[PDB]
């Protein structure tokens, strides 16, 4: 059964609700982004209307085989009528194709569903500037002050400089980057660009990247591993055993691996600066964990919410424990008392 925080009152609509079967009263199923916890349940046998971005639509059609007649892509930043209700999709600054959804209810209420997002000051100049929001359905993944991490630009600066130094010292080093979902493509794309290489990967991952509308993509990626000195591998293979095994396959072309594991936050964030990050090393293999986040930090979240001044907040992450729910409610009340709404 579909939980309450996935239903939009006063409409026939659900958000990210595909794992509950036929939801009673649902006339349109919205999908915020192509991450498996959110699409869980979709397939070629789905026969209800799915509303989403163009990019999410490409992924539904090619990767999950959902039939074309049930895929409804909408442009961003554009007022659209869906089953007699005005909606707008906004860029969520998460993975490719990820949106927030603004719903203008027939009774006058306005609702924002963030999906998964990384809040940014640039959102204060979207179509959100123009009117009041009564209800906010909020991505609370990192809603606690301990969750600090650097900007995505600082993280990429660290990775490019680390890779370029290593391969310039040793032209026979291979760089490897882990992946297990869409998102974080700038990590491997930026490193390959500095090195003058395409990114090599499996046929399955190439297919996924080809759905993403990235400019000039044919110039940046390839299935021919031998021509490439940046390889992508599944995240599970980013360990000493998996990487040893990979270097054997390369036919003595390389004699060293430098590997990157993009994570979210880890408790080494509570003490160390990005500058000061060090790898795990065994022999000719070094592995860097880098904190490249596609979710808001606590401070970015707090800034957004204090600017939006919603009348009510419904968290969509960390909702399963009483301690989590209580902690989140406390911070929402501090923020409201501090800013005066
Ligand atoms: Ni996500």
GROMACS .gro file of N, CA and C in nm, residues 32-191:
model
  480
   32UNK      N    1   0.998   1.143  -1.071
   32UNK     CA    2   1.092   1.258  -1.058
   32UNK      C    3   1.229   1.236  -1.125
   33UNK      N    4   1.276   1.111  -1.123
   33UNK     CA    5   1.410   1.078  -1.178
   33UNK      C    6   1.430   0.928  -1.191
   34UNK      N    7   1.528   0.893  -1.273
   34UNK     CA    8   1.558   0.748  -1.300
   34UNK      C    9   1.661   0.690  -1.200
   35UNK      N   10   1.626   0.681  -1.071
   35UNK     CA   11   1.699   0.612  -0.965
   35UNK      C   12   1.609   0.494  -0.914
   36UNK      N   13   1.674   0.379  -0.887
   36UNK     CA   14   1.591   0.256  -0.871
   36UNK      C   15   1.496   0.256  -0.754
   37UNK      N   16   1.531   0.318  -0.643
   37UNK     CA   17   1.439   0.331  -0.525
   37UNK      C   18   1.310   0.407  -0.570
   38UNK      N   19   1.321   0.495  -0.671
   38UNK     CA   20   1.204   0.575  -0.719
   38UNK      C   21   1.126   0.514  -0.831
   39UNK      N   22   1.191   0.447  -0.928
   39UNK     CA   23   1.119   0.379  -1.034
   39UNK      C   24   1.073   0.234  -1.000
   40UNK      N   25   1.107   0.184  -0.879
   40UNK     CA   26   1.083   0.040  -0.840
   40UNK      C   27   0.940  -0.002  -0.874
   41UNK      N   28   0.927  -0.092  -0.973
   41UNK     CA   29   0.800  -0.142  -1.028
   41UNK      C   30   0.769  -0.121  -1.173
   42UNK      N   31   0.821  -0.018  -1.236
   42UNK     CA   32   0.799   0.003  -1.380
   42UNK      C   33   0.861  -0.107  -1.465
   43UNK      N   34   0.801  -0.134  -1.583
   43UNK     CA   35   0.841  -0.236  -1.684
   43UNK      C   36   0.764  -0.219  -1.815
   44UNK      N   37   0.796  -0.299  -1.918
   44UNK     CA   38   0.717  -0.301  -2.047
   44UNK      C   39   0.566  -0.333  -2.037
   45UNK      N   40   0.525  -0.385  -1.921
   45UNK     CA   41   0.383  -0.423  -1.898
   45UNK      C   42   0.301  -0.312  -1.832
   46UNK      N   43   0.366  -0.201  -1.793
   46UNK     CA   44   0.293  -0.087  -1.732
   46UNK      C   45   0.200  -0.024  -1.836
   47UNK      N   46   0.072  -0.004  -1.798
   47UNK     CA   47  -0.029   0.056  -1.888
   47UNK      C   48  -0.098   0.185  -1.836
   48UNK      N   49  -0.039   0.256  -1.737
   48UNK     CA   50  -0.093   0.390  -1.697
   48UNK      C   51  -0.001   0.505  -1.744
   49UNK      N   52  -0.053   0.630  -1.747
   49UNK     CA   53   0.025   0.742  -1.800
   49UNK      C   54   0.134   0.778  -1.696
   50UNK      N   55   0.255   0.792  -1.753
   50UNK     CA   56   0.372   0.832  -1.673
   50UNK      C   57   0.413   0.968  -1.722
   51UNK      N   58   0.424   1.064  -1.627
   51UNK     CA   59   0.471   1.196  -1.656
   51UNK      C   60   0.613   1.221  -1.597
   52UNK      N   61   0.695   1.281  -1.679
   52UNK     CA   62   0.841   1.292  -1.645
   52UNK      C   63   0.911   1.388  -1.739
   53UNK      N   64   1.043   1.413  -1.718
   53UNK     CA   65   1.125   1.482  -1.814
   53UNK      C   66   1.152   1.402  -1.947
   54UNK      N   67   1.204   1.473  -2.047
   54UNK     CA   68   1.248   1.409  -2.174
   54UNK      C   69   1.353   1.302  -2.143
   55UNK      N   70   1.457   1.337  -2.065
   55UNK     CA   71   1.563   1.241  -2.036
   55UNK      C   72   1.518   1.116  -1.963
   56UNK      N   73   1.433   1.133  -1.859
   56UNK     CA   74   1.376   1.019  -1.787
   56UNK      C   75   1.293   0.935  -1.886
   57UNK      N   76   1.220   1.004  -1.973
   57UNK     CA   77   1.144   0.931  -2.078
   57UNK      C   78   1.230   0.844  -2.172
   58UNK      N   79   1.347   0.894  -2.212
   58UNK     CA   80   1.442   0.816  -2.296
   58UNK      C   81   1.485   0.692  -2.223
   59UNK      N   82   1.513   0.702  -2.091
   59UNK     CA   83   1.558   0.592  -2.010
   59UNK      C   84   1.446   0.487  -1.989
   60UNK      N   85   1.321   0.532  -1.964
   60UNK     CA   86   1.205   0.441  -1.950
   60UNK      C   87   1.184   0.354  -2.075
   61UNK      N   88   1.194   0.419  -2.189
   61UNK     CA   89   1.174   0.355  -2.323
   61UNK      C   90   1.290   0.260  -2.352
   62UNK      N   91   1.415   0.302  -2.335
   62UNK     CA   92   1.531   0.215  -2.382
   62UNK      C   93   1.581   0.117  -2.283
   63UNK      N   94   1.581   0.152  -2.154
   63UNK     CA   95   1.632   0.066  -2.051
   63UNK      C   96   1.526  -0.021  -1.986
   64UNK      N   97   1.404   0.032  -1.961
   64UNK     CA   98   1.298  -0.052  -1.898
   64UNK      C   99   1.195  -0.106  -1.996
   65UNK      N  100   1.199  -0.059  -2.123
   65UNK     CA  101   1.106  -0.090  -2.239
   65UNK      C  102   0.960  -0.052  -2.231
   66UNK      N  103   0.935   0.044  -2.144
   66UNK     CA  104   0.798   0.096  -2.126
   66UNK      C  105   0.751   0.141  -2.262
   67UNK      N  106   0.625   0.110  -2.299
   67UNK     CA  107   0.580   0.146  -2.434
   67UNK      C  108   0.557   0.293  -2.449
   68UNK      N  109   0.594   0.342  -2.566
   68UNK     CA  110   0.587   0.480  -2.608
   68UNK      C  111   0.455   0.552  -2.581
   69UNK      N  112   0.344   0.479  -2.597
   69UNK     CA  113   0.211   0.536  -2.576
   69UNK      C  114   0.181   0.576  -2.430
   70UNK      N  115   0.252   0.519  -2.334
   70UNK     CA  116   0.234   0.555  -2.193
   70UNK      C  117   0.339   0.654  -2.137
   71UNK      N  118   0.435   0.695  -2.220
   71UNK     CA  119   0.540   0.792  -2.178
   71UNK      C  120   0.499   0.934  -2.219
   72UNK      N  121   0.482   1.022  -2.117
   72UNK     CA  122   0.447   1.162  -2.138
   72UNK      C  123   0.559   1.260  -2.093
   73UNK      N  124   0.651   1.293  -2.183
   73UNK     CA  125   0.759   1.385  -2.144
   73UNK      C  126   0.705   1.528  -2.143
   74UNK      N  127   0.743   1.611  -2.044
   74UNK     CA  128   0.716   1.754  -2.041
   74UNK      C  129   0.840   1.842  -2.040
   75UNK      N  130   0.837   1.954  -2.106
   75UNK     CA  131   0.950   2.044  -2.106
   75UNK      C  132   0.965   2.105  -1.968
   76UNK      N  133   1.083   2.152  -1.933
   76UNK     CA  134   1.100   2.226  -1.808
   76UNK      C  135   1.060   2.372  -1.819
   77UNK      N  136   1.033   2.435  -1.704
   77UNK     CA  137   1.008   2.577  -1.690
   77UNK      C  138   0.889   2.622  -1.770
   78UNK      N  139   0.790   2.534  -1.783
   78UNK     CA  140   0.675   2.562  -1.876
   78UNK      C  141   0.545   2.520  -1.809
   79UNK      N  142   0.444   2.607  -1.806
   79UNK     CA  143   0.319   2.574  -1.745
   79UNK      C  144   0.243   2.474  -1.836
   80UNK      N  145   0.204   2.359  -1.781
   80UNK     CA  146   0.140   2.247  -1.857
   80UNK      C  147   0.013   2.208  -1.785
   81UNK      N  148  -0.094   2.174  -1.858
   81UNK     CA  149  -0.214   2.118  -1.794
   81UNK      C  150  -0.219   1.965  -1.806
   82UNK      N  151  -0.226   1.899  -1.693
   82UNK     CA  152  -0.233   1.753  -1.685
   82UNK      C  153  -0.361   1.715  -1.614
   83UNK      N  154  -0.448   1.642  -1.688
   83UNK     CA  155  -0.578   1.596  -1.634
   83UNK      C  156  -0.649   1.711  -1.557
   84UNK      N  157  -0.652   1.828  -1.622
   84UNK     CA  158  -0.713   1.951  -1.571
   84UNK      C  159  -0.647   2.023  -1.455
   85UNK      N  160  -0.519   1.993  -1.428
   85UNK     CA  161  -0.444   2.060  -1.321
   85UNK      C  162  -0.315   2.121  -1.380
   86UNK      N  163  -0.290   2.250  -1.353
   86UNK     CA  164  -0.161   2.316  -1.391
   86UNK      C  165  -0.040   2.260  -1.310
   87UNK      N  166   0.062   2.218  -1.382
   87UNK     CA  167   0.191   2.169  -1.325
   87UNK      C  168   0.307   2.234  -1.395
   88UNK      N  169   0.422   2.242  -1.326
   88UNK     CA  170   0.549   2.289  -1.384
   88UNK      C  171   0.659   2.192  -1.337
   89UNK      N  172   0.751   2.154  -1.427
   89UNK     CA  173   0.871   2.079  -1.388
   89UNK      C  174   0.991   2.172  -1.385
   90UNK      N  175   1.071   2.163  -1.278
   90UNK     CA  176   1.190   2.242  -1.255
   90UNK      C  177   1.315   2.154  -1.241
   91UNK      N  178   1.431   2.200  -1.290
   91UNK     CA  179   1.556   2.125  -1.269
   91UNK      C  180   1.590   2.108  -1.118
   92UNK      N  181   1.609   1.979  -1.079
   92UNK     CA  182   1.638   1.950  -0.936
   92UNK      C  183   1.785   1.956  -0.898
   93UNK      N  184   1.876   1.983  -0.994
   93UNK     CA  185   2.022   1.977  -0.961
   93UNK      C  186   2.057   1.850  -0.884
   94UNK      N  187   2.010   1.735  -0.941
   94UNK     CA  188   2.041   1.599  -0.888
   94UNK      C  189   2.112   1.526  -1.003
   95UNK      N  190   2.060   1.420  -1.059
   95UNK     CA  191   2.117   1.346  -1.174
   95UNK      C  192   2.055   1.395  -1.302
   96UNK      N  193   2.103   1.349  -1.419
   96UNK     CA  194   2.042   1.393  -1.545
   96UNK      C  195   1.893   1.356  -1.556
   97UNK      N  196   1.812   1.454  -1.597
   97UNK     CA  197   1.671   1.431  -1.609
   97UNK      C  198   1.584   1.448  -1.483
   98UNK      N  199   1.650   1.474  -1.368
   98UNK     CA  200   1.579   1.486  -1.236
   98UNK      C  201   1.504   1.617  -1.228
   99UNK      N  202   1.381   1.611  -1.179
   99UNK     CA  203   1.295   1.734  -1.164
   99UNK      C  204   1.233   1.745  -1.025
  100UNK      N  205   1.200   1.870  -0.993
  100UNK     CA  206   1.097   1.903  -0.891
  100UNK      C  207   0.968   1.934  -0.967
  101UNK      N  208   0.855   1.913  -0.897
  101UNK     CA  209   0.723   1.933  -0.958
  101UNK      C  210   0.640   2.035  -0.874
  102UNK      N  211   0.594   2.140  -0.942
  102UNK     CA  212   0.503   2.241  -0.878
  102UNK      C  213   0.363   2.207  -0.921
  103UNK      N  214   0.271   2.184  -0.827
  103UNK     CA  215   0.130   2.153  -0.854
  103UNK      C  216   0.042   2.270  -0.802
  104UNK      N  217  -0.045   2.317  -0.896
  104UNK     CA  218  -0.135   2.432  -0.864
  104UNK      C  219  -0.278   2.371  -0.846
  105UNK      N  220  -0.320   2.343  -0.722
  105UNK     CA  221  -0.440   2.262  -0.695
  105UNK      C  222  -0.566   2.340  -0.729
  106UNK      N  223  -0.675   2.269  -0.771
  106UNK     CA  224  -0.792   2.345  -0.806
  106UNK      C  225  -0.848   2.434  -0.695
  107UNK      N  226  -0.827   2.401  -0.566
  107UNK     CA  227  -0.873   2.489  -0.455
  107UNK      C  228  -0.785   2.612  -0.425
  108UNK      N  229  -0.673   2.636  -0.498
  108UNK     CA  230  -0.582   2.748  -0.471
  108UNK      C  231  -0.450   2.718  -0.395
  109UNK      N  232  -0.439   2.600  -0.346
  109UNK     CA  233  -0.316   2.556  -0.272
  109UNK      C  234  -0.208   2.537  -0.379
  110UNK      N  235  -0.084   2.572  -0.343
  110UNK     CA  236   0.031   2.537  -0.428
  110UNK      C  237   0.126   2.439  -0.346
  111UNK      N  238   0.164   2.331  -0.416
  111UNK     CA  239   0.252   2.228  -0.355
  111UNK      C  240   0.383   2.215  -0.437
  112UNK      N  241   0.500   2.215  -0.369
  112UNK     CA  242   0.630   2.181  -0.436
  112UNK      C  243   0.676   2.043  -0.385
  113UNK      N  244   0.701   1.952  -0.479
  113UNK     CA  245   0.763   1.819  -0.446
  113UNK      C  246   0.905   1.826  -0.500
  114UNK      N  247   1.006   1.826  -0.413
  114UNK     CA  248   1.145   1.839  -0.457
  114UNK      C  249   1.201   1.716  -0.532
  115UNK      N  250   1.139   1.601  -0.521
  115UNK     CA  251   1.204   1.477  -0.561
  115UNK      C  252   1.331   1.470  -0.480
  116UNK      N  253   1.437   1.411  -0.537
  116UNK     CA  254   1.572   1.425  -0.483
  116UNK      C  255   1.636   1.553  -0.544
  117UNK      N  256   1.701   1.634  -0.463
  117UNK     CA  257   1.759   1.763  -0.507
  117UNK      C  258   1.885   1.802  -0.432
  118UNK      N  259   1.967   1.888  -0.493
  118UNK     CA  260   2.074   1.956  -0.431
  118UNK      C  261   2.042   2.110  -0.433
  119UNK      N  262   1.983   2.166  -0.325
  119UNK     CA  263   1.947   2.304  -0.326
  119UNK      C  264   2.057   2.396  -0.367
  120UNK      N  265   2.015   2.502  -0.441
  120UNK     CA  266   2.113   2.601  -0.486
  120UNK      C  267   2.049   2.737  -0.488
  121UNK      N  268   2.129   2.846  -0.459
  121UNK     CA  269   2.073   2.983  -0.468
  121UNK      C  270   2.009   3.021  -0.604
  122UNK      N  271   2.054   2.960  -0.713
  122UNK     CA  272   1.992   2.983  -0.841
  122UNK      C  273   1.843   2.944  -0.850
  123UNK      N  274   1.799   2.852  -0.762
  123UNK     CA  275   1.656   2.818  -0.752
  123UNK      C  276   1.568   2.933  -0.702
  124UNK      N  277   1.629   3.031  -0.636
  124UNK     CA  278   1.556   3.145  -0.583
  124UNK      C  279   1.518   3.237  -0.706
  125UNK      N  280   1.570   3.209  -0.828
  125UNK     CA  281   1.532   3.283  -0.954
  125UNK      C  282   1.469   3.203  -1.064
  126UNK      N  283   1.412   3.090  -1.026
  126UNK     CA  284   1.331   3.013  -1.116
  126UNK      C  285   1.189   3.069  -1.108
  127UNK      N  286   1.093   2.998  -1.169
  127UNK     CA  287   0.948   3.019  -1.147
  127UNK      C  288   0.903   3.009  -1.002
  128UNK      N  289   0.984   2.958  -0.909
  128UNK     CA  290   0.947   2.965  -0.767
  128UNK      C  291   0.937   3.103  -0.707
  129UNK      N  292   1.003   3.201  -0.767
  129UNK     CA  293   1.007   3.341  -0.713
  129UNK      C  294   0.863   3.407  -0.709
  130UNK      N  295   0.784   3.370  -0.807
  130UNK     CA  296   0.657   3.433  -0.842
  130UNK      C  297   0.536   3.414  -0.754
  131UNK      N  298   0.537   3.315  -0.663
  131UNK     CA  299   0.421   3.285  -0.577
  131UNK      C  300   0.454   3.200  -0.456
  132UNK      N  301   0.356   3.198  -0.370
  132UNK     CA  302   0.358   3.131  -0.244
  132UNK      C  303   0.344   2.980  -0.257
  133UNK      N  304   0.413   2.903  -0.172
  133UNK     CA  305   0.398   2.755  -0.159
  133UNK      C  306   0.343   2.717  -0.022
  134UNK      N  307   0.232   2.648  -0.018
  134UNK     CA  308   0.165   2.613   0.107
  134UNK      C  309   0.234   2.488   0.163
  135UNK      N  310   0.259   2.386   0.079
  135UNK     CA  311   0.313   2.254   0.124
  135UNK      C  312   0.443   2.223   0.046
  136UNK      N  313   0.542   2.180   0.120
  136UNK     CA  314   0.676   2.137   0.060
  136UNK      C  315   0.700   1.988   0.092
  137UNK      N  316   0.715   1.903  -0.009
  137UNK     CA  317   0.748   1.761   0.012
  137UNK      C  318   0.902   1.760  -0.010
  138UNK      N  319   0.981   1.742   0.097
  138UNK     CA  320   1.122   1.779   0.096
  138UNK      C  321   1.217   1.655   0.104
  139UNK      N  322   1.318   1.653   0.015
  139UNK     CA  323   1.434   1.557   0.023
  139UNK      C  324   1.519   1.598   0.143
  140UNK      N  325   1.501   1.521   0.255
  140UNK     CA  326   1.568   1.540   0.381
  140UNK      C  327   1.684   1.444   0.405
  141UNK      N  328   1.748   1.394   0.296
  141UNK     CA  329   1.856   1.294   0.308
  141UNK      C  330   1.960   1.337   0.409
  142UNK      N  331   2.009   1.462   0.407
  142UNK     CA  332   2.113   1.515   0.494
  142UNK      C  333   2.068   1.625   0.592
  143UNK      N  334   1.946   1.602   0.649
  143UNK     CA  335   1.890   1.703   0.737
  143UNK      C  336   1.942   1.693   0.882
  144UNK      N  337   2.073   1.723   0.901
  144UNK     CA  338   2.135   1.726   1.033
  144UNK      C  339   2.264   1.799   1.017
  145UNK      N  340   2.305   1.886   1.114
  145UNK     CA  341   2.418   1.973   1.093
  145UNK      C  342   2.556   1.909   1.072
  146UNK      N  343   2.572   1.784   1.110
  146UNK     CA  344   2.695   1.712   1.088
  146UNK      C  345   2.724   1.689   0.941
  147UNK      N  346   2.621   1.702   0.857
  147UNK     CA  347   2.640   1.671   0.715
  147UNK      C  348   2.690   1.792   0.643
  148UNK      N  349   2.822   1.795   0.631
  148UNK     CA  350   2.894   1.896   0.559
  148UNK      C  351   2.974   1.822   0.447
  149UNK      N  352   2.992   1.893   0.340
  149UNK     CA  353   3.075   1.845   0.225
  149UNK      C  354   3.105   1.965   0.133
  150UNK      N  355   3.209   1.955   0.045
  150UNK     CA  356   3.244   2.073  -0.037
  150UNK      C  357   3.152   2.093  -0.160
  151UNK      N  358   3.176   2.202  -0.232
  151UNK     CA  359   3.100   2.221  -0.358
  151UNK      C  360   3.143   2.113  -0.459
  152UNK      N  361   3.060   2.086  -0.557
  152UNK     CA  362   3.091   1.991  -0.664
  152UNK      C  363   3.214   2.045  -0.744
  153UNK      N  364   3.223   2.176  -0.762
  153UNK     CA  365   3.339   2.237  -0.836
  153UNK      C  366   3.472   2.209  -0.763
  154UNK      N  367   3.476   2.219  -0.631
  154UNK     CA  368   3.601   2.188  -0.551
  154UNK      C  369   3.640   2.040  -0.563
  155UNK      N  370   3.543   1.951  -0.556
  155UNK     CA  371   3.563   1.811  -0.567
  155UNK      C  372   3.618   1.776  -0.702
  156UNK      N  373   3.565   1.834  -0.808
  156UNK     CA  374   3.614   1.805  -0.943
  156UNK      C  375   3.756   1.862  -0.963
  157UNK      N  376   3.781   1.981  -0.910
  157UNK     CA  377   3.918   2.037  -0.911
  157UNK      C  378   4.020   1.936  -0.850
  158UNK      N  379   3.989   1.879  -0.734
  158UNK     CA  380   4.073   1.779  -0.666
  158UNK      C  381   4.096   1.656  -0.756
  159UNK      N  382   3.989   1.603  -0.817
  159UNK     CA  383   4.000   1.482  -0.898
  159UNK      C  384   4.086   1.510  -1.024
  160UNK      N  385   4.059   1.618  -1.096
  160UNK     CA  386   4.134   1.650  -1.224
  160UNK      C  387   4.286   1.660  -1.187
  161UNK      N  388   4.313   1.735  -1.083
  161UNK     CA  389   4.459   1.767  -1.043
  161UNK      C  390   4.527   1.636  -1.002
  162UNK      N  391   4.462   1.553  -0.921
  162UNK     CA  392   4.511   1.420  -0.880
  162UNK      C  393   4.540   1.327  -0.997
  163UNK      N  394   4.448   1.315  -1.091
  163UNK     CA  395   4.463   1.230  -1.210
  163UNK      C  396   4.576   1.282  -1.303
  164UNK      N  397   4.575   1.412  -1.334
  164UNK     CA  398   4.671   1.472  -1.428
  164UNK      C  399   4.811   1.456  -1.368
  165UNK      N  400   4.824   1.478  -1.237
  165UNK     CA  401   4.960   1.460  -1.176
  165UNK      C  402   5.008   1.316  -1.191
  166UNK      N  403   4.927   1.218  -1.151
  166UNK     CA  404   4.965   1.079  -1.156
  166UNK      C  405   5.001   1.026  -1.292
  167UNK      N  406   4.927   1.064  -1.396
  167UNK     CA  407   4.946   1.006  -1.530
  167UNK      C  408   5.067   1.080  -1.595
  168UNK      N  409   5.089   1.205  -1.555
  168UNK     CA  410   5.208   1.280  -1.609
  168UNK      C  411   5.332   1.220  -1.548
  169UNK      N  412   5.330   1.184  -1.422
  169UNK     CA  413   5.449   1.116  -1.362
  169UNK      C  414   5.469   0.977  -1.423
  170UNK      N  415   5.357   0.904  -1.445
  170UNK     CA  416   5.360   0.771  -1.504
  170UNK      C  417   5.263   0.751  -1.618
  171UNK      N  418   5.304   0.777  -1.745
  171UNK     CA  419   5.222   0.754  -1.865
  171UNK      C  420   5.163   0.614  -1.879
  172UNK      N  421   5.214   0.521  -1.803
  172UNK     CA  422   5.158   0.385  -1.799
  172UNK      C  423   5.057   0.356  -1.688
  173UNK      N  424   5.009   0.460  -1.619
  173UNK     CA  425   4.897   0.444  -1.521
  173UNK      C  426   4.758   0.450  -1.595
  174UNK      N  427   4.667   0.370  -1.541
  174UNK     CA  428   4.525   0.363  -1.585
  174UNK      C  429   4.446   0.430  -1.479
  175UNK      N  430   4.347   0.511  -1.519
  175UNK     CA  431   4.249   0.563  -1.422
  175UNK      C  432   4.116   0.489  -1.435
  176UNK      N  433   4.062   0.451  -1.320
  176UNK     CA  434   3.931   0.380  -1.309
  176UNK      C  435   3.835   0.459  -1.220
  177UNK      N  436   3.709   0.470  -1.261
  177UNK     CA  437   3.602   0.540  -1.185
  177UNK      C  438   3.481   0.446  -1.169
  178UNK      N  439   3.436   0.429  -1.046
  178UNK     CA  440   3.316   0.347  -1.012
  178UNK      C  441   3.184   0.416  -1.044
  179UNK      N  442   3.082   0.339  -1.079
  179UNK     CA  443   2.945   0.390  -1.103
  179UNK      C  444   2.846   0.277  -1.068
  180UNK      N  445   2.726   0.310  -1.021
  180UNK     CA  446   2.615   0.209  -1.007
  180UNK      C  447   2.475   0.260  -1.038
  181UNK      N  448   2.469   0.380  -1.096
  181UNK     CA  449   2.346   0.445  -1.127
  181UNK      C  450   2.386   0.564  -1.219
  182UNK      N  451   2.289   0.627  -1.279
  182UNK     CA  452   2.312   0.760  -1.338
  182UNK      C  453   2.337   0.866  -1.229
  183UNK      N  454   2.396   0.976  -1.268
  183UNK     CA  455   2.445   1.081  -1.181
  183UNK      C  456   2.598   1.082  -1.167
  184UNK      N  457   2.654   1.198  -1.130
  184UNK     CA  458   2.798   1.210  -1.103
  184UNK      C  459   2.890   1.192  -1.228
  185UNK      N  460   2.831   1.209  -1.344
  185UNK     CA  461   2.903   1.184  -1.474
  185UNK      C  462   3.016   1.285  -1.484
  186UNK      N  463   3.006   1.407  -1.425
  186UNK     CA  464   3.115   1.504  -1.433
  186UNK      C  465   3.250   1.447  -1.381
  187UNK      N  466   3.248   1.354  -1.283
  187UNK     CA  467   3.373   1.296  -1.224
  187UNK      C  468   3.458   1.233  -1.337
  188UNK      N  469   3.400   1.145  -1.414
  188UNK     CA  470   3.477   1.063  -1.514
  188UNK      C  471   3.491   1.155  -1.639
  189UNK      N  472   3.393   1.233  -1.674
  189UNK     CA  473   3.405   1.321  -1.793
  189UNK      C  474   3.517   1.425  -1.774
  190UNK      N  475   3.531   1.488  -1.657
  190UNK     CA  476   3.631   1.590  -1.635
  190UNK      C  477   3.773   1.531  -1.635
  191UNK      N  478   3.789   1.413  -1.577
  191UNK     CA  479   3.920   1.347  -1.571
  191UNK      C  480   3.958   1.309  -1.714
   0.00000   0.00000   0.00000
